[PDB]
């Protein structure tokens, strides 16, 4: 058998084809060709009625369209069973091969198979697909449209491993051993005995274990010696190999990662990893990926798990649905533990064309299809049934917790916003930030297990800074929308000191300060005074598109902004889940028009104290004791710069120039060598600088980008909320002073030149060996 990736040159047609676009003879000759993943939807223009889409689903277009693929089947494949893998298509695909109806699939997350072969022919063989985003207010976030995942023929000896058909469980007996099952689904039609053979390799490439059996379900006991713990800190994965065999000759094979790690609950001391007890610093995030919309490519996931990672992130909560396999394997071997959510709401819509309309006939199909599809997982640590349910039900309760239990006996069970029963563990959500509210469920139920799922909410726009709080109800309200139930937030200043700002009432500030109950701050000191409570996953790590009214692209929820730039809040949680030595200031020190004005400057911290400098005279020196450090400083133009120190040495520095006029511009990439035709992303930031190379935190720049030699755009964005602008074309502004472009390499190997320019700019040249 093989795998066969199946993404290359697929016919496209937006908007509906009518019947006949499913059949053998149809013409497609006028169809657009590109590559999948696609998500046509990022490819459109805003409109803030004419799509059908809303402030949820983000104001993108949906509806009907169409993709055709044809292919020719092999003489070495004559004997073969085919199918094809869909690892996520949204939504209502349905797929036709060679005129005949396999199947129409509503859940627009779930990875899904079907079987080609009774259907092939002689030559030519035709794929049709038809995806049916017409109903289109289905998310209340955006969603994309289209083949979004990586498709793939997976053909076999028709003696096989079934898609999703591999159970891995192992248990540890304290370090010097683990036990392991092995079960295994084999599709066979012939009665001859199979001999089994499955492998354990090590990390480091060797075999650490091989177990046998004869098959006539095959399920293998078996043990290792000093097995590798998996853990955030040592992402050791192991990749199972499992072959059907017959007179030593393999039939078939399949290969999954793997890992050994005790996983231990408790309603008093919390969550244990190995024995060894661990909070968990925890993130919501949604599956778009900002200019690439749904389609993201695996360097891209990379990139903004590894910054996650480096925050001091241990754990993601895939919010409110499957994600792809991709990202199951990366937090695998990048070692982030997931809690993997299957469901938003159940059959109550939440947005009145959700999955809400399918639950009651499609939720068992599609979850035991999820969880067969990702229990081997060993970053996976926790399930979650669903979140801020409408209409629940004991009855539906139930009927999900027992089949997490049943096909997952091995991990626990939760569900968003069911503080106050048939879960493990009690997740809470906006109401575990009010006053009292984590106390009095202590107080009352000291037996139950709880987890904050998304807890806390704040509000922060990238370079915006406001030195007054704000309160979401009363300043910036959402669409639906006390004061003794806050954890209050003061004034930095008695008047404010960036009047300027209430001009843009769509952005929220970057100081701790504008939020819904509670600071970031806060909620994590209250967090960790309760052993009880397992952690928190805050609500919004990137800013994601939709759930914002118009004229917002974007929400402000995230503490890294949609183009995977650093906010603030990035660095404030950095110092609070970090050990590294490191100091953060903010704001910037360009304050041009405010000689003489109070600006407060704050200072974020993992020292013993820090002392701060304005053109290297002291304003004091103060001690670390758990709260943001403030010095009220009057603006003189200048570098301002605080200092970092641990056991009286310094250790750690932060500063900031004030700018002059922009001048240039930097250019900072990721990567400066990429393989030709490949799916690698080149990431290249851009700061508007002035003439001393000083970044302008004010720029608004419209910049061109220009690529010469076997280059392609992939998209740019600069962060900003409130533009919208087209994603694939080679223009963008900055947003306060920052923008970012994204390359890939095209067929052909050679050298590569990207020219970034600007009226009134020095251009600025980046070169990139393909």
């Not at 696609?38 to 799509?51: L, R, V």
């Not at 005790?262 to 309603?267: A, D, G």
């Not at 067969?372 to 409408?390: A, L, Y």
């Not at 002291?618 to 641990?646: C, D, F, H, M, N």
């Amino acid at each position: 058998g093989e795998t066969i990736n199946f993404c290359k040159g697929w016919k496209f047609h937006l908007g509906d084809a009518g019947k006949g676009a499913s059949s053998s003879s149809y013409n497609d000759s006028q169809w657009r060709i590109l590559n999948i993943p696609h998500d046509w939807s990022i490819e459109g223009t805003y409109k803030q009625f004419e799509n059908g889409t809303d402030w949820q689903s983000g104001f993108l277009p949906a509806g009907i369209s169409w993709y055709r693929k044809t292919f020719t089947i092999p003489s070495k494949w004559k004997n073969k069973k085919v199918q094809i893998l869909f690892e996520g298509v949204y939504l209502n695909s349905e797929v036709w091969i060679n005129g005949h109806w396999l199947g129409k699939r509503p859940n627009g997350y779930i990875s899904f198979v079907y079987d080609l072969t009774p259907y092939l022919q002689e030559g030519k063989n035709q794929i049709a697909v038809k995806v049916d985003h017409s109903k289109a207010l289905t998310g209340r976030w955006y969603t994309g449209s289209g083949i979004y995942r990586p498709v793939y023929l997976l053909v076999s000896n028709p003696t096989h491993i079934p898609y999703s058909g591999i159970h891995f469980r192992s248990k540890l007996q304290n370090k010097q051993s683990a036990t392991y099952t092995l079960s295994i689904e084999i599709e066979t039609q012939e009665k001859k005995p199979i001999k089994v053979k499955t492998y354990l390799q090590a990390p480091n490439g060797s075999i650490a274990d091989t177990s046998e059996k004869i098959f006539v379900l095959c399920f293998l006991s078996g043990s290792i010696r000093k097995p590798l713990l998996w853990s955030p800190d040592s992402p050791n994965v192991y990749t199972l190999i499992c072959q059907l065999t017959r007179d030593n000759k393999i039939l078939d094979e399949c290969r999954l990662p793997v890992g050994f790690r005790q996983l231990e609950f408790n309603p008093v001391s919390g969550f244990l990893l190995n024995g060894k007890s661990l909070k968990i610093k925890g993130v919501c995030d949604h599956h778009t990926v900002g200019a690439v919309g749904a389609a993201v490519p695996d360097d891209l996931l990379h990139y903004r798990l590894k910054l996650l990672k480096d925050m001091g992130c241990n754990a993601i909560r895939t919010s409110h649905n499957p994600f792809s396999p991709a990202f199951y394997n990366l937090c695998d071997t990048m070692g982030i533990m997931v809690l993997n959510e299957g469901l938003d709401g159940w059959n109550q819509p939440k947005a009145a064309d959700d999955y809400g309309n399918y639950f009651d006939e499609w939720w068992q199909k599609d979850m035991t299809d999820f969880i067969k599809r990702d229990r081997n997982h060993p970053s996976i640590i926790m399930w979650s049934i669903g979140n801020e349910v409408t209409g629940a039900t004991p009855e539906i309760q139930h009927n999900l917790v027992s089949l997490f239990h049943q096909l997952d006996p091995d991990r626990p069970v939760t569900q968003g916003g069911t503080d106050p029963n048939y879960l493990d563990i009690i997740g809470f959500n906006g109401n575990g930030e009010e006053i009292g509210e984590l106390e009095h469920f202590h107080k009352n139920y000291p037996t139950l297990c709880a987890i904050a799922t998304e807890v806390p909410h704040t509000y922060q726009t990238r370079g915006v800074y406001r030195s007054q709080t704000q309160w979401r109800r009363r300043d910036f309200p959402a669409p639906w929308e006390f004061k003794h139930r806050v954890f209050p937030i003061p004034d930095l200043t008695e008047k404010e000191c960036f009047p300027e700002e209430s001009d843009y009432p769509y952005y929220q500030s970057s100081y701790d300060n504008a939020s819904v109950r509670i600071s970031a701050r806060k909620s994590w000191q209250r967090t960790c005074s309760f052993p009880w409570l397992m952690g928190e996953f805050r609500w919004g790590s990137f800013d994601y598109l939709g759930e914002a009214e118009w004229p917002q692209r974007c929400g402000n929820f995230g503490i890294i902004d949609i183009a995977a730039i650093p906010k603030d809040a990035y660095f404030l949680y950095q110092s609070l889940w970090t050990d590294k030595p490191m100091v953060h200031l903010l704001p910037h020190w360009t304050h041009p028009g405010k000689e003489g004005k109070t600006i407060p400057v704050v200072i974020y911290t993992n020292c013993d104290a820090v002392e701060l400098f304005i053109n290297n005279v002291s304003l004091g020196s103060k001690p670390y004791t758990g709260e943001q450090l403030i010095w009220l400083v009057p603006y003189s133009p200048g570098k301002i710069e605080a200092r970092g120190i641990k056991k009286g040495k310094i250790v750690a520095t932060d500063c900031y120039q004030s700018a002059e006029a922009p001048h240039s511009v930097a250019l900072a990439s990721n990567k400066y060598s990429v393989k030709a035709g490949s799916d690698e992303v080149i990431r290249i930031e851009i700061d508007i600088t002035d003439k001393n190379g000083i970044p302008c935190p004010y720029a608004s720049n419209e910049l061109s980008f220009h690529v010469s030699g076997p280059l392609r755009l992939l998209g740019v964005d600069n962060g900003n909320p409130t533009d919208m602008f087209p994603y694939q074309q080679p223009h963008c502004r900055c947003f306060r002073g920052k923008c970012v472009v994204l390359l890939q390499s095209d067929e052909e190997k050679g050298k590569g030149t990207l020219t970034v320019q600007g009226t009134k700019l020095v251009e600025k040249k980046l070169i990139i060996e393909v």
